[PDB]
Amino acid sequence: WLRDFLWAQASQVINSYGSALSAYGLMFLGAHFVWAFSLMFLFSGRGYWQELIESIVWAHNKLKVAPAIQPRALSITQGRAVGVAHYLLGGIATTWAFFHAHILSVG
Amino acid sequence: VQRGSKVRILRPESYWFQDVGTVASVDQSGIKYPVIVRFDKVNYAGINTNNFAVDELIEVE
Amino acid sequence: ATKFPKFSQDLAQDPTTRRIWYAMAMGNDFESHDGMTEENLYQKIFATHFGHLAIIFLWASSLLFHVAWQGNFEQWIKDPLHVRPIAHAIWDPHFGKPAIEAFTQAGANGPVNIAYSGVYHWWYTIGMRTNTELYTGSVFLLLFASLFLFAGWLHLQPKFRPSLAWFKSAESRLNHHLAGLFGVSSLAWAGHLIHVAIPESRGQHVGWDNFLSTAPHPAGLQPFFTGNWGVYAQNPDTAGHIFSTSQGAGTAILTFLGGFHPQTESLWLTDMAHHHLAIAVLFIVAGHMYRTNFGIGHSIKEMMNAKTFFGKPVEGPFNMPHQGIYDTYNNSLHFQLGWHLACLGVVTSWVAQHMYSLPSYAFIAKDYTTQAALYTHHQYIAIFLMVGAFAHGAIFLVRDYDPEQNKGNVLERVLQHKEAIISHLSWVSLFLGFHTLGLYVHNDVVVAFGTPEKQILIEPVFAQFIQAAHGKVLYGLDTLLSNPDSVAYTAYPNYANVWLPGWLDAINSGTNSLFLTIGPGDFLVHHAIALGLHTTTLILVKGALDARGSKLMPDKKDFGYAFPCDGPGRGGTCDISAWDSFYLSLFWALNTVGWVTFYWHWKHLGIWQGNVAQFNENSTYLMGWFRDYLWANSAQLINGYNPYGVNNLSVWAWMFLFGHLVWATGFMFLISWRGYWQELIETLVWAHERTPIANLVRWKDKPVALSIVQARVVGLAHFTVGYVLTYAAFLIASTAGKF
Amino acid sequence: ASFLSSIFVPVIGWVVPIATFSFLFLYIERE
Amino acid sequence: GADLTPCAENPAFQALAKNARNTTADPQSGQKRFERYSQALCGPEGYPHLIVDGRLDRAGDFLIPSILFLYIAGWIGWVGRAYLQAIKKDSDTEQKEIQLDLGIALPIIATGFAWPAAAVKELLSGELTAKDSEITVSPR
Amino acid sequence: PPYTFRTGWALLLLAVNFLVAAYYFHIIQ
Amino acid sequence: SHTVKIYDTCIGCTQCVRACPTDVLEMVPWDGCKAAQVASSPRTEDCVGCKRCETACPTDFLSIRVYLGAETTRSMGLAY
Amino acid sequence: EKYAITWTSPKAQVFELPTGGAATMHEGENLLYIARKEYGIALGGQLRKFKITNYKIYRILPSGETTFIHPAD
Amino acid sequence: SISDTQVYIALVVALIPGLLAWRLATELYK
């Protein structure tokens, strides 16, 4: 399944620069990014990121750019929800850009 | 102090440490922290009021 | 109510399976054991340190014995450039007959594993020639490891057990370890090179039988005491010296050519002999500095607490308050352990940076896969030693730190302005990431649209200079040892640049890894490395400095180092502890060393194949990394076993899939958290007490789900093991399948 | 003497974990 | 180095000039970028390698866009700073954050072009920063 | 106060930054 | 079991007693505060570490605190 | 069995068991054997919307000892 | 390779740290 399906059929999606299938080459890499980006929300917790903002609100308090609406980290349920929405988006769009550039070439 | 006096906070464990409050009411005998200070920004719990001692505050008005 | 674990009554009174798991991760934590006093702590760590020391010699003896008995060392002497080394042999009953024929390799009778750790090159360099010296050195390390196993037992007996003041005598360790452990051992190895290894390099056998009769030099120690030391640097091994033969040999034992041997492309053994001799003199002199019972020498506690610079009152050394730091380093063991891992973590990567460019082993620059593995090995070792430096540094601030003893000093002043440290660390991480990712995606879109000339390519003109300020003519900067009229080139008062004619021959050849030619593809990756170093440091420093409490949660010191959270209150506190900032950083630390070893590996796949143009064109945009390195090199690997047959890469093809599976398993412990699983196990506890035959048996420990801190350990363990094994199967077989 | 692989590898594969796990299971479950 | 001979002399840059791809539907947008890129430095590959050194013959790469960016970027900070200075002395200040007081935001936007003349004025008056006794801090 | 000890060492280090650039700009050789 | 420390800063809000689900907490009279009662935890062998009592307390910082200690059967929340 | 809970009801009505599912209390004194004290207070608050505040959680030890633990008075 | 005799010397010598490792690991307590 790795050799003859994922490796062998991706030879049309990553070799597609300088041609009309260039956007599927960019959406293939661009969706590998958003998938990997989602793990920052899934693995980590809220209570780390609230502590980090307290050290950035300080440098925003020092130069008098303190916002009246206080910054907070995303809540525990939302940090899971952001981490699954960015997960499903980048995982499906990888396959979206892989099915097209393979089958708009051999079809 | 009095109802409307801007004070400051020196309690380190408090959220509004070195911030400007506003005294809402001062009690007379008990609790040991008899000063209600209505702050303007909220903590993580969402509230903006707390009790403080008499010597805890720094009057700035 | 059991008596296990012995070191804790709070864990031994646990009815669940939490009793079992927390025994393992608190067993070697000697400081949290029940009734552990202070002097009993040090006396137990000191004898434990004999236990880890004797594992190392028992480990290194199996490298000698499995090569002497199952490898082809004596057949590797005859031609090291084509004979492929052997680590050990396979006895696997589960093999099929086409998988015995595929691993019967390198001229052997049975299935053997090709050694990719380069220990044949190190043993051949230091004089060892036959399989009997390997066996003799193996048996010696059996006795030398048992000499430490007995020493750790001896120093636990009551009148042989050292007192507390023996451990906290820090000025006497620095005199003995610098002069003796560092200096004499560098002196002894210089004695090993000159008496043995350099004569073995010239076809002249010097063993234990005839080293007292034969002299390393026909002058023979008369020019040493008379001061005529230039006799030792007479006629060296010439440029036609065929290694371990008498052709083009010399008589010199301490020489200073600089550069590389012309055949082996390693450093000269006469250069290493004057090196470790000169290192030895610099360290024995360094070990006569600190004050011991002989009433002479510097005193560190007086150097810290000093307040007067030649009459002028100051705050301390460099006018900086360093008082109380002597009672902070020496009294705490986590300050020491957190410190020395940073010291060992710097040098470990510093080993790896200087062993691909300056090879010191015979014929190791041409055995490629042994060289690609040694860089990536000591880079990942340097990763954990740096993460554990901040980890054990942050255990210090929770547990051992005392602000009253450390009042007003330099370590107190860091904790004041800690919000200014984390802010400017958060700036550089965002300032690099917004503009380094921006220029890869800029180059990705521009190449994809068929107009690749619109790339933003920057020459690294500040590291172009240093390579030309070290003597590379290839760029034409014409400065500083590449300018032959320079004051630095000529050494104007004394003209004593002996190393320099041999250095400029090595750096100006395109046949080595010495100061590789850099271009615009190397600009972006060093700024991508700098993204990874400032961001991993951001997580570790912020977890170190906020370890004693902050706004969202004060008094975090009352909860220890590893606690899950403080509940869903105040918006929730998931991953708030100082342990949790160790935890997030090891994703970055494994990431950053991916970047430094994807970039190491693909620049050398162009040098080793003669195609430098593939890297310099395609490493500016992120498809060329993805296509020409990840996709193109994994064709030899994945065809290790197919429906047509197998070959010798089928372990690495199997371990590559094995690594993808351990990696993916660790996501289950991290996305899904505990409370899903305790409500699942409570249905299995139900359906075991109801099944009629299978409820004859029943647990002793009640089954509970893994705790919150535990499956962040177990989740990071499957993640890290799978990260290592995946790349280590790709690094070997993509290099050992192409050569 | 390559026949020692036939007698050390099954002992470490089979006999060493059976002797270790049956000791540790009876040691952790010991009042 | 490495081989930064100028692009007008290269066999590689002139070989990349014959198979030009038109950027915009201008039929000679393929040609009117290669004559413009001739003064830059193309290496062995044929691509202009920018020089961020500060040399004045190479000021167009990094020196000219750096002044151009830092005027525009220090603008957006100064406009966003001076608005938040204004709304703090109002009745609510949280409504004027999400729901923009357009009567106050628009004088601040036009004001901005003397922000180097204002930031240095704010710096020397000591009104750029704040006191460390007036900022909340974490317990040490 | 005018921070003499802070600016004294910052101007020393910046003089090292300008000296190496003089080798790179061929001002000193 | 766990450890429930109650400091002297609370106001007798009775929000922590009405939130601990194993009923560890109770109000005792105490002449300090305005409501003249302080929370007390006389049954900390029943506490399950829920930290509902820390979530419901108004005062900054919290007058009540749960220190997670050795976990017996009553504090693991095991029905078996 | 452990931690019996008793309550006196004015009538019969359908409530929700803490072990999952809906039962029907009698009129008068009731009795429910639950597993833990956490069930009895989570049930005791479900009685509060039925305007019942007469509930008593016991503690039935396996020896037969029944300790009245809620309320204290 | 090495002779068949020399492998048995290596096994008997290896019992000397094997005995001493059992003494150290049990002097460090149970």
Ligand code: CLA
């Ligand atoms: C001259 C006398 C002397 C000597 C030789 C030593 C030697 C040692 N002491 Mg020590 N000690 C001494 C006096 C001495 N001590 C005195 C007087 C005191 C009391 C004041 C102490 C108190 C003391 C304590 C409390 C402890 C030690 C420990 C150690 C061991 C250090 C760990 C180790 O093996 O690293 C070996 C390190 C080197 C050989 C040098 C490495 C240098 C860098 C890291 C690498 C350089 C290598 C280079 C790159 C090439 C390598 C390549 C090659 C491998 C291929 C080592 C055996 C520790 C230990 O483990 O106990 C057994 C320990 O806990 N000592």
Ligand code: CLA
């Ligand atoms: C020489 C260096 C050194 C020393 C002496 C120590 C010593 C200590 N550390 Mg430390 N540490 C180190 C390096 C070191 N560490 C490094 C390099 C890191 C970074 C990774 C850390 C990170 C760290 C943390 C985060 C913590 C410690 C803790 C501790 C203390 C208890 C250790 C313990 O409970 O072990 C228990 C041992 C284990 C649980 C081992 C499990 C992990 C193993 C290695 C996984 C192996 C995977 C598997 C076998 C692979 C199989 C492959 C196969 C499938 C193919 C002890 C004082 C803990 C503490 O509380 O300090 C007081 C603590 O919280 N350390």
Ligand code: CLA
């Ligand atoms: C830790 C070091 C080490 C390791 C990993 C190996 C690894 C291996 N040996 Mg080897 N060996 C070693 C040292 C080592 N050797 C030494 C010093 C000797 C000389 C006595 C031998 C003698 C030897 C023979 C004679 C044979 C092997 C064989 C093997 C293979 C199968 C495993 C087996 O049956 O073990 C065999 C183990 C022994 C005979 C005794 C072990 C000796 C060491 C010193 C014990 C180390 C224990 C360790 C430190 C405890 C810590 C555990 C850790 C998890 C904490 C494997 C390649 C077999 C083979 O090649 O099959 C193809 C085989 O026939 N070995």
Ligand code: CLA
């Ligand atoms: C009023 C606008 C404003 C200003 C002047 C600053 C100023 C500062 N920020 Mg900040 N910041 C802001 C908005 C602002 N910030 C917002 C909205 C966010 C959330 C995305 C952040 C997130 C943030 C982080 C995470 C960090 C800073 C940092 C900094 C400092 C260094 C500059 C920098 O790195 O830029 C950082 C800029 C960004 C991350 C993105 C800029 C946000 C948008 C694009 C600009 C806002 C324009 C505004 C909405 C226009 C309103 C106009 C009004 C009339 C309606 C400096 C004190 C850094 C620091 O502490 O260094 C010491 C740091 O680490 N800030």
Ligand SMILES: CC1=C(/C=C/C(C)=C/C=C/C(C)=C/C=C/C=C(C)/C=C/C=C(C)/C=C/C2=C(C)CCCC2(C)C)C(C)(C)CCC1
């Ligand atoms: C180039 C060169 C040079 C120079 C060099 C140098 C100068 C170097 C540097 C180096 C360095 C500069 C290094 C550093 C490093 C650092 C680090 C590595 C750090 C870390 C740290 C740590 C980790 C800590 C910890 C802790 C914490 C965290 C908390 C508290 C406690 C403690 C403190 C412990 C010379 C002239 C010689 C020669 C020529 C060339």
Ligand SMILES: CC1=C(/C=C/C(C)=C/C=C/C(C)=C\C=C\C=C(C)\C=C\C=C(C)\C=C\C2=C(C)CCCC2(C)C)C(C)(C)CCC1
């Ligand atoms: C020339 C050049 C160069 C160099 C550079 C340098 C190195 C620099 C440095 C610099 C520095 C080292 C700086 C620092 C700074 C710091 C600070 C401290 C700042 C300040 C700031 C502030 C304070 C801010 C303010 C503001 C503004 C201005 C606007 C907006 C708003 C705000 C408020 C934000 C290079 C080679 C790259 C390139 C070429 C050219």
Ligand SMILES: CC1=C(C/C=C(\C)CCC[C@H](C)CCC[C@H](C)CCCC(C)C)C(=O)c2ccccc2C1=O
């Ligand atoms: C990174 C991360 C954060 C921090 C990430 C945040 C806060 C994302 C916010 C980023 C956006 C860009 C904030 C937008 C602010 C303004 C709208 C920016 C102005 C720009 C407009 C003009 C478009 C969490 O809060 C969190 C919570 C729970 C689990 C995991 C995580 C987690 O992983």
Ligand SMILES: CC1=C(C/C=C(\C)CCC[C@H](C)CCC[C@H](C)CCCC(C)C)C(=O)c2ccccc2C1=O
């Ligand atoms: C699956 C899973 C469980 C359930 C896992 C349990 C109950 C343990 C299952 C392990 C079984 C017993 C196999 C363990 C044996 C391993 C194959 C090897 C371990 C050998 C060493 C321990 C020596 C959790 O409890 C959990 C808790 C918090 C976050 C995530 C999770 C999580 O993902």
Ligand code: SF4
């Ligand atoms: S601890 Fe909290 S809930 Fe209890 S009396 Fe004090 S403020 Fe009220």
Ligand code: SF4
């Ligand atoms: S542990 Fe916390 S949530 Fe549970 S009963 Fe006690 S105070 Fe309430």
